[PDB]
Amino acid sequence: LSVFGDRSTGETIRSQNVMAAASIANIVKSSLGPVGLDKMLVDDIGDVTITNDGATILKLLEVEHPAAKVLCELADLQDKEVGDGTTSVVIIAAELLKNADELVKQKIHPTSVISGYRLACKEAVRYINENLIVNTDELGRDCLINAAKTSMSSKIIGINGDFFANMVVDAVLAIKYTDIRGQPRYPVNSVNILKAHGRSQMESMLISGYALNCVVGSQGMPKRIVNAKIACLDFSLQKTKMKLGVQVVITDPEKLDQIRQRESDITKERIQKILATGANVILTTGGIDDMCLKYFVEAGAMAVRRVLKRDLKRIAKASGATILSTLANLEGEETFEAAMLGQAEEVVQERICDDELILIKNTKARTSASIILRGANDFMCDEMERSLHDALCVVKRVLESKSVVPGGGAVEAALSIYLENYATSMGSREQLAIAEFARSLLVIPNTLAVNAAQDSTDLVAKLRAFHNEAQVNPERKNLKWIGLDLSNGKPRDNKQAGVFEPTIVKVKSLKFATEAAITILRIDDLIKL
Amino acid sequence: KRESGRKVQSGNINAAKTIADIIRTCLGPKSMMKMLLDPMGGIVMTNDGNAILREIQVQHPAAKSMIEISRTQDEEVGDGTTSVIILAGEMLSVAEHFLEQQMHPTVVISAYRKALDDMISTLKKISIPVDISDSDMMLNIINSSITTKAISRWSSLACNIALDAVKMVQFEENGRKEIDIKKYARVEKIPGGIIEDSCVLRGVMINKDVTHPRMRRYIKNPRIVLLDSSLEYKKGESQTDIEITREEDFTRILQMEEEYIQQLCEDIIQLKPDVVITEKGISDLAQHYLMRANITAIRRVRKTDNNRIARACGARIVSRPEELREDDVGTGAGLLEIKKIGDEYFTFITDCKDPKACTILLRGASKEILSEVERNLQDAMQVCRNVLLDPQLVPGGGASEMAVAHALTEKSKAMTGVEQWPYRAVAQALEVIPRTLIQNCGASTIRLLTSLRAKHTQENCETWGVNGETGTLVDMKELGIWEPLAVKLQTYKTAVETAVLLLRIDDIVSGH
Amino acid sequence: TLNPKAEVARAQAALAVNISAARGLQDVLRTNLGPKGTMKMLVSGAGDIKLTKDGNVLLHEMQIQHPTASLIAKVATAQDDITGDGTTSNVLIIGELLKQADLYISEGLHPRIITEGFEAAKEKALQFLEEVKVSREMDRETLIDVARTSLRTKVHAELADVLTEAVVDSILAIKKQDEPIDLFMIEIMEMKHKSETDTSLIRGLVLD
Amino acid sequence: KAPGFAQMLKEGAKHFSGLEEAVYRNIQACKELAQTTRTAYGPNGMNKMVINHLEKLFVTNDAATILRELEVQHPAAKMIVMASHMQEQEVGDGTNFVLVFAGALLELAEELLRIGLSVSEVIEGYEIACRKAHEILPNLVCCSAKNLRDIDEVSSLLRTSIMSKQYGNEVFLAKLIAQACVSIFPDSGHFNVDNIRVCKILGSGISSSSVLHGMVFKKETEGDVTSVKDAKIAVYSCPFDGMITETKGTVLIKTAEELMNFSKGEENLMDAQVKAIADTGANVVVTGGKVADMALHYANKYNIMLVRLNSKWDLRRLCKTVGATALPRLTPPVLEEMGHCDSVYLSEVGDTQVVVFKHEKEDGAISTIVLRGSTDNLMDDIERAVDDGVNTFKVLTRDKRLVPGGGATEIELAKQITSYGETCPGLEQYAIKKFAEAFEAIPRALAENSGVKANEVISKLYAVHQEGNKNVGLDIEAEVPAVKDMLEAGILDTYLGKYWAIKLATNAAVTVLRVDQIIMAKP
Amino acid sequence: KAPGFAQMLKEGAKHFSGLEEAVYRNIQACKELAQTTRTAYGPNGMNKMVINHLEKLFVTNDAATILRELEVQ
Numbered sequence A: 001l002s003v004f005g006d007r008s009t010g011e012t013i014r015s016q017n018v019m020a021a022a023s024i025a026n027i028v029k030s031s032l033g034p035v036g037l038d039k040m041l042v043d044d045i046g047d048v049t050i051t052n053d054g055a056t057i058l059k060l061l062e063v064e065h066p067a068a069k070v071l072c073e074l075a076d077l078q079d080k081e082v083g084d085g086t087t088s089v090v091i092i093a094a095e096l097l098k099n100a101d102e103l104v105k106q107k108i109h110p111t112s113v114i115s116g117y118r119l120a121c122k123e124a125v126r127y128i129n130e131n132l133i134v135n136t137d138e139l140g141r142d143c144l145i146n147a148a149k150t151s152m153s154s155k156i157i158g159i160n161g162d163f164f165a166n167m168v169v170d171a172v173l174a175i176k177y178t179d180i181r182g183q184p185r186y187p188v189n190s191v192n193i194l195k196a197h198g199r200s201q202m203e204s205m206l207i208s209g210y211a212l213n214c215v216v217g218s219q220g221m222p223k224r225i226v227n228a229k230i231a232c233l234d235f236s237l238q239k240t241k242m243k244l245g246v247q248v249v250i251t252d253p254e255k256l257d258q259i260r261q262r263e264s265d266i267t268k269e270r271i272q273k274i275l276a277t278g279a280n281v282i283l284t285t286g287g288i289d290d291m292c293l294k295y296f297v298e299a300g301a302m303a304v305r306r307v308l309k310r311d312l313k314r315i316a317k318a319s320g321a322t323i324l325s326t327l328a329n330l331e332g333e334e335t336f337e338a339a340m341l342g343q344a345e346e347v348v349q350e351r352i353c354d355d356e357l358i359l360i361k362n363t364k365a366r367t368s369a370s371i372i373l374r375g376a377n378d379f380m381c382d383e384m385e386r387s388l389h390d391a392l393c394v395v396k397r398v399l400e401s402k403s404v405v406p407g408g409g410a411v412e413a414a415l416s417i418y419l420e421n422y423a424t425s426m427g428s429r430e431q432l433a434i435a436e437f438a439r440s441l442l443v444i445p446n447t448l449a450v451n452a453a454q455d456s457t458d459l460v461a462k463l464r465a466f467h468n469e470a471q472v473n474p475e476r477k478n479l480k481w482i483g484l485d486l487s488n489g490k491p492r493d494n495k496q497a498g499v500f501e502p503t504i505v506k507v508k509s510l511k512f513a514t515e516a517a518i519t520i521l522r523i524d525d526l527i528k529l
Numbered sequence B: 001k002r003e004s005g006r007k008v009q010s011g012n013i014n015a016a017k018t019i020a021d022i023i024r025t026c027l028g029p030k031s032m033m034k035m036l037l038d039p040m041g042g043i044v045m046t047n048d049g050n051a052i053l054r055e056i057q058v059q060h061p062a063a064k065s066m067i068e069i070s071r072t073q074d075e076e077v078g079d080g081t082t083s084v085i086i087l088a089g090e091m092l093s094v095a096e097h098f099l100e101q102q103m104h105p106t107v108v109i110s111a112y113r114k115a116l117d118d119m120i121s122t123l124k125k126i127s128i129p130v131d132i133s134d135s136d137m138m139l140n141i142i143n144s145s146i147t148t149k150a151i152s153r154w155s156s157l158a159c160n161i162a163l164d165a166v167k168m169v170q171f172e173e174n175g176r177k178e179i180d181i182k183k184y185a186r187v188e189k190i191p192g193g194i195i196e197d198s199c200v201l202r203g204v205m206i207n208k209d210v211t212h213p214r215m216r217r218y219i220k221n222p223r224i225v226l227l228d229s230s231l232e233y234k235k236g237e238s239q240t241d242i243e244i245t246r247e248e249d250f251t252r253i254l255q256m257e258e259e260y261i262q263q264l265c266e267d268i269i270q271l272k273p274d275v276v277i278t279e280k281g282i283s284d285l286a287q288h289y290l291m292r293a294n295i296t297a298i299r300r301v302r303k304t305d306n307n308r309i310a311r312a313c314g315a316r317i318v319s320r321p322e323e324l325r326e327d328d329v330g331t332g333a334g335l336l337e338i339k340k341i342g343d344e345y346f347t348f349i350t351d352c353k354d355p356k357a358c359t360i361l362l363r364g365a366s367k368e369i370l371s372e373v374e375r376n377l378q379d380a381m382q383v384c385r386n387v388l389l390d391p392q393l394v395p396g397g398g399a400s401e402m403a404v405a406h407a408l409t410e411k412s413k414a415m416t417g418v419e420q421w422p423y424r425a426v427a428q429a430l431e432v433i434p435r436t437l438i439q440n441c442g443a444s445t446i447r448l449l450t451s452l453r454a455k456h457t458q459e460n461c462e463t464w465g466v467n468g469e470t471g472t473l474v475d476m477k478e479l480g481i482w483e484p485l486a487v488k489l490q491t492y493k494t495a496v497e498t499a500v501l502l503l504r505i506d507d508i509v510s511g512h
Numbered sequence C: 001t002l003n004p005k006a007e008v009a010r011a012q013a014a015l016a017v018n019i020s021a022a023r024g025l026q027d028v029l030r031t032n033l034g035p036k037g038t039m040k041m042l043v044s045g046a047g048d049i050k051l052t053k054d055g056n057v058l059l060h061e062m063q064i065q066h067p068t069a070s071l072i073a074k075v076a077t078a079q080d081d082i083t084g085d086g087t088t089s090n091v092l093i094i095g096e097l098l099k100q101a102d103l104y105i106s107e108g109l110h111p112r113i114i115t116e117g118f119e120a121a122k123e124k125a126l127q128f129l130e131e132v133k134v135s136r137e138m139d140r141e142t143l144i145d146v147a148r149t150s151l152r153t154k155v156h157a158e159l160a161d162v163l164t165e166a167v168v169d170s171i172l173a174i175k176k177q178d179e180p181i182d183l184f185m186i187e188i189m190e191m192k193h194k195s196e197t198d199t200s201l202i203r204g205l206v207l208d
Numbered sequence D: 001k002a003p004g005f006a007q008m009l010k011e012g013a014k015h016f017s018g019l020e021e022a023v024y025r026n027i028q029a030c031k032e033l034a035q036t037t038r039t040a041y042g043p044n045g046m047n048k049m050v051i052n053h054l055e056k057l058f059v060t061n062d063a064a065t066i067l068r069e070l071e072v073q074h075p076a077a078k079m080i081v082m083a084s085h086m087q088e089q090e091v092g093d094g095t096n097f098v099l100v101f102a103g104a105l106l107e108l109a110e111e112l113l114r115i116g117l118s119v120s121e122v123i124e125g126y127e128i129a130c131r132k133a134h135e136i137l138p139n140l141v142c143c144s145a146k147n148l149r150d151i152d153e154v155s156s157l158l159r160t161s162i163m164s165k166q167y168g169n170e171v172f173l174a175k176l177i178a179q180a181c182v183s184i185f186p187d188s189g190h191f192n193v194d195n196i197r198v199c200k201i202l203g204s205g206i207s208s209s210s211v212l213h214g215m216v217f218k219k220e221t222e223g224d225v226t227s228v229k230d231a232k233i234a235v236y237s238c239p240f241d242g243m244i245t246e247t248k249g250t251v252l253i254k255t256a257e258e259l260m261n262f263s264k265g266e267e268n269l270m271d272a273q274v275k276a277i278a279d280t281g282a283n284v285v286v287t288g289g290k291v292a293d294m295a296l297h298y299a300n301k302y303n304i305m306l307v308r309l310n311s312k313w314d315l316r317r318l319c320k321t322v323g324a325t326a327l328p329r330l331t332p333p334v335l336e337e338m339g340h341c342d343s344v345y346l347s348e349v350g351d352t353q354v355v356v357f358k359h360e361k362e363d364g365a366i367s368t369i370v371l372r373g374s375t376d377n378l379m380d381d382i383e384r385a386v387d388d389g390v391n392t393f394k395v396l397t398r399d400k401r402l403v404p405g406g407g408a409t410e411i412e413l414a415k416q417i418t419s420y421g422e423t424c425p426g427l428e429q430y431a432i433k434k435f436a437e438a439f440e441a442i443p444r445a446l447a448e449n450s451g452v453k454a455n456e457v458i459s460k461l462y463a464v465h466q467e468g469n470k471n472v473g474l475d476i477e478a479e480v481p482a483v484k485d486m487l488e489a490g491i492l493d494t495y496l497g498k499y500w501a502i503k504l505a506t507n508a509a510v511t512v513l514r515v516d517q518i519i520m521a522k523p
Numbered sequence E: 001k002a003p004g005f006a007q008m009l010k011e012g013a014k015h016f017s018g019l020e021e022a023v024y025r026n027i028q029a030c031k032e033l034a035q036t037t038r039t040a041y042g043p044n045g046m047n048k049m050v051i052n053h054l055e056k057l058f059v060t061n062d063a064a065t066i067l068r069e070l071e072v073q
């Protein structure tokens, strides 16, 4: 046939798409898990982006091949839907194609393979749902402390993980709020982590409220407030100006005198209007005039100047104060009574090393707290802030999700035995496909073992043995839900170790990976133009 | 196209090792020269490790990482950069345990990161403090750079310049004791004089030229003014140019141009100043008021350059000139001088105060000798920065390397596991530093390096290094080759952190 | 052990490349040392011929193919700027210094050891020069011996007496009472239509 | 065109230049010799599909058979092979110790020469470490043979030598060889492997073997005589067939009756020939080739015991014990060259009749192990285990000193030598330390052949030895890379086996290091 | 690539070695110039079939006219 392009058919087209998807998987295979190896990304210009995150690699990975682009489009579906598990998807889909391509050489049609993989994903989601654990064990139990402890052990904080783990679990539960029909989620903006030179790391205290790195200035004001009213004004009480890009042109010398005298005078109404509202715990963003600070001394208000915008943003969300940018309501001037006032119970400025941090207590509805990392030097306080911030999201992801599942290859190892037994029940040119779907899942624990510098053949075999014994009989002597510990190089029960993942990840990753291999297996020809 | 598998790590090793083999002999006072064939057939016979790699073309990205990490070293520390690449190349050159033994890089990286914490602890044990109050000790310390240079004739001059200069910038009251040589120690050259005339100005020197003669030539009590806005007619929000064709409209737009520039200048001269310093430019009409006021015209002064002035003379920064209050006056300033010293004007606003900043005056007989004195003084300022930030020195001449290596080899005896093998290999990699110092002098490497390790076993490890000039062994207490601690710790971390980086690479991928 | 689009000489053969260049440049300039030495031609390519024995002209104006040898040419430029003589003898000693060093380097001796001997031999050789120098008073009889010794190395032993008396008298006219001297006081003019031996002095100045 | 080859002036031999490291090349020839036998080391040794010079297929793991069939042409490898041949003298084991250890000494020597250390200084370190090893090896002697001549004792210690030649069947072979060795140890100061012979017979399996006294021969008695106590044994190499006259002896036959007359004359002559055997007082006769039908009945006529030995080595085996030498003529009545024996009888063992030469009248110090196997290649490989097993106890007739095996001594001897090099100042410490690392190659060989990460075995073997737990070796197991005590398991090596192996291996390595250039010659 | 060129180091100018006798090459060029004009000597001088730069044919026996048209290089 004569055409204005090129065509290529046969079984080799399946193999070419198989080796392509297999190549893309090997680019993100060794970088699987938390001990994944970094990889270079040589751009067209010459920059080199070094990273180990599989999602960041696939976003920047540029392989001009159709089958590879299907997995790149597949990555966006998993990132938007869930935001995790993209690396396991490309690896699972690559092994299903390499195994299916072998079946096609045994005269197994792809339609029979596509049918087997669809039924295997259905039964796998059933076995997963039947072997979950709901979001529980918060208080009175522990599948948590062990979760945060294992996450922070990488840094120097791991000397005493129990002491710091309790500060995470107690605060992670403190930030709970239903807010939609019994949803409860947890905020990404989390407990503020300050620090101090408290002579040792053990001196770090857990506070039941927000901590701010500011001071009232003049000592005439009180440091122990109980008034519930909390003011929040972004308009500065100092010398106001038109704009940094607009200088008020002034010519006459006498006009400059009354401008100085009036501006000093107008604040006497602004300060009387602010003091009349009764707010004692006052916070100002754009600074406060020196004479205005003296007015809070006689009134006894706990005013603070030059408060950070973002730290103040969380205080308005805490006490519920309406953030006001200007006093003038387009014709006059007012403080907007009962608008910028919050609701609290007590505010006391405690004594902390080198910076007197103010503590707010029992706001209206904040769902936040503060921790002061009292340590030896900045190197430890800067490292513990990163460890706690990582471990904070480890427990947050578990309690936010409604159901979880044992990770570390426990799902892939359990399904390897169930689906292999389910294959013997169906038959009809689908027994081999469901069996290869079972064997393909073992790449995840086999890949995680290689990255952990251990014998993958032995650990993968040890997982399937503890999981197979669970199927033979339900006796308690047979271990159950055994995962894979990467550090010690030995299987471990993830329920005690706290290695948990969301259920939607293992469910969507098996579904999306199955749909991808189906999309490529149906390709038996290529037409170029 | 791309690389994958064991070919990557072994390939990154050969690239980093190859870059280190170039500058193996560029270490020490008896460093060897290198011949760089230019594309036009020319040659440069430099012996600087930074200059050699800067001019060489590299294809492997691993080499670009080694070179780019060395440039980051030069910005922080102008010394010991050659030791980083050699150690990083020797730590990576042990490919026996890497691939031939089929160990995973995580096993190797865990050992390299364990040794690094031990190398850091051992260096602090063999350290020694310094009495920074006595400048005589800092002279012997700073002579490590002045030695084998043209400025040896005025060696003590370079020390007093760099020593006292960094002490002014050192603001210890803030706790961390930060120093900024780039900003608060701006250096400017002055033609004329000789090397002996080089000194430090206790102020801020602006290289602005004198546009008109109607300017203050000599003052005893300057009064400097500061402002960021430009002295020109107020334009619109956009950059639209003013196009006019009617003559009657010219006098209107002209009068607006003159009055606003006139009124703004009238407020600047109300305080009776001596010089108007503006961040932005100053137009011709605006300068007509400065020359009429018999004050100096200055422009194009950066923010930090103006911040130092307000600390020196006591001026105050203002947004526009109209808001100039009486506070913006440089009372207490030493003098204002715009003298043409060496066919070039120089603005001196020196005073009797130390406003956390200074300016170095590089006098000389020619531009060739000025540049020689310039680059030789910057390193002396950095050595003063490294000692004043952490006054602890460690024995040089390969003693700190052999001293640390003995600690790991003795500590590896209690290291049960497979990590003991790469843990000991890092110790043998530190021996390369005296291996190159002995190779350059010409003495036998195996004979002296063998006896050198025996001295650290029996005698104290704080001494008994190597003499690069003579080649024989010598105590660092008898020879002032003492180097700072912050340079060696950062040199040891950057070598391990760099080797850990290239070992973590397993796939050189292309894509954007 | 090298990157593509480049080359590197790792072993000691790189040093032999530089020794071979100096040995070659030695054999080129050795034939024009002294009065009895031969002359070298400088063909500019455009069609201009030029004969001269001045080693500074045979290295500065003559472009050298070898990269290493062009470095030594730049030194002959620097040598001519200070003293104005000895550029040829400078290259011959450099060629023989590196030649003798190769005899010992081939026996396994490091270069740095040989260079330290040159620094010692230089100081001894520099001290001995102070003893051999003759600090006599400079008279017309002495400067003629200096001018003849300098001019016979650049002419055909015919313009010796011609340019000798002119070169000596030109200097004596511009120094008295131990005043600092400057050769820019002497103008050098050129004119045709006369034989080479018609050179003479001009007490005044020539205008175009 | 110049520049041609450098340092090439002797018959154009391949002379490696200073850059090509002529010493590094002779070492590579020895390293390749180790890899051919590094895998066959230990109980889990890998077999080698050896192709004999007769195009015969043999699968074996014995080192001496590998090198005997592998034509080693490199002289640098011949020296180490000559040490293996010298290892066979004074001991019958430790051959691969010479190949593996010497290969590690030379392989590790390259790491020293590459640094710049002189070859003459490397030799001084190995000679110092070899002398130091001989001082530490007596201190590692854990147990010693009681010399009670107990089969329970001899079989227990013999298990270690039998393994690594025929694994799995170390129980039967240890009991049989113990029964054969114990019966000669009463002959004090005369034990030798030449007495304990081996006779392979095609049979069911190795379990069907047993031990019998006297020189046993698999070929049953061809004659009809069951037993005969005659001392005079007449051995003839020429078979019983149609006679030929050494002189002219021209035989012309034309008619058919003359054919029958000459045929009868030959039978009457052969009847007189066998008659002469009995006339010389000898009721026993041996034959190499075929045996005639009429001569067979003549052997039964005078009750002469007919014996058939087709193998040449079987004939020479009798010539040096009984004295009966083979003559070129067919039945010459030469009574002077006959043998002497106390008893000769037939015996059925394992459903097979075998000729026996038992010493009933005499004390008797000779035995034979009758092996049974369904394959000739299998029995031959089991025969090699008998030699290495019997020779293990020929050494125990000397000073009885056993040391732990399984790589246990190799780590302790390395640990003790490494400490001597650390405290010894100078340049010899570099080669002394590498001499200790050469010992680590032997545990690394056992671990690699068992499917275990070798670096994990060395890490564990050094930890238990750091705590003083000597006599700890590698636990041979596929799914267990841990270690165990060699004393409790009963694994023990011989002292003289390690002594002469460390000595000959160092001399072979030093002899190769002393050589720097191989040069051709001509007579 | 070694071996290098004997004495050729200046702009690729052929420096005839000592065995090559560089002085002899210049003598050969001057020797060849005489042979062209040696035959134009005396009353019995042989004329030259000269071709001008303008492709003009002139026959002469003058020596200076030959060297003008013969571009000596």
Ligand SMILES: Nc1ncnc2c1ncn2[C@@H]1O[C@H](COP(=O)(O)OP(=O)(O)O)[C@@H](O)[C@H]1O
Residues within 6 Å of the ligand: A032, A033, A034, A054, A055, A084, A085, A086, A087, A088, A089, A407, A408, A409, A444, A448, A484, A485, A486, A499
């Ligand atoms: N703490 C842990 N212990 C063991 N395995 C883990 C742990 N955390 C993550 N993993 C494993 O790493 C794999 C990848 O995790 P993640 O990076 O979140 O997804 P992806 O690699 O697809 O981006 C998961 O399949 C999981 O089994």
Ligand SMILES: Nc1ncnc2c1ncn2[C@@H]1O[C@H](COP(=O)(O)OP(=O)(O)O)[C@@H](O)[C@H]1O
Residues within 6 Å of the ligand: B026, B027, B028, B029, B049, B079, B080, B081, B082, B083, B144, B396, B397, B398, B433, B437, B466, B467, B468, B469, B481, B483
């Ligand atoms: N006078 C000396 N004697 C002995 N060793 C020296 C001497 N000067 C410098 N060194 C050694 O040479 C090494 C390199 O010094 P230097 O050239 O200042 O740094 P770099 O080589 O990185 O430029 C240092 O580690 C130091 O120990």
Ligand SMILES: Nc1ncnc2c1ncn2[C@@H]1O[C@H](COP(=O)(O)OP(=O)(O)O)[C@@H](O)[C@H]1O
Residues within 6 Å of the ligand: C032, C033, C034, C035, C053, C054, C055, C085, C086, C087, C088, C089, C090, C149, C150, C152, C153, C154
């Ligand atoms: N009568 C003369 N006799 C002997 N040697 C001479 C004489 N004149 C000059 N020379 C030698 O010629 C050498 C070269 O002289 P000159 O041409 O001035 O320097 P260069 O050759 O370096 O340019 C000198 O080293 C000198 O010794």
Ligand SMILES: Nc1ncnc2c1ncn2[C@@H]1O[C@H](COP(=O)(O)OP(=O)(O)O)[C@@H](O)[C@H]1O
Residues within 6 Å of the ligand: D040, D041, D042, D043, D063, D093, D094, D095, D096, D097, D160, D161, D162, D163, D164, D165, D388, D404, D405, D406, D407, D446, D473, D474, D475, D476, D491, D493
């Ligand atoms: N059960 C066992 N466990 C550990 N090591 C063994 C065992 N059996 C034999 N060996 C080892 O095998 C090695 C080789 O034995 P052998 O084959 O007789 O000598 P060679 O290998 O020199 O011929 C011995 O050093 C011994 O320690």
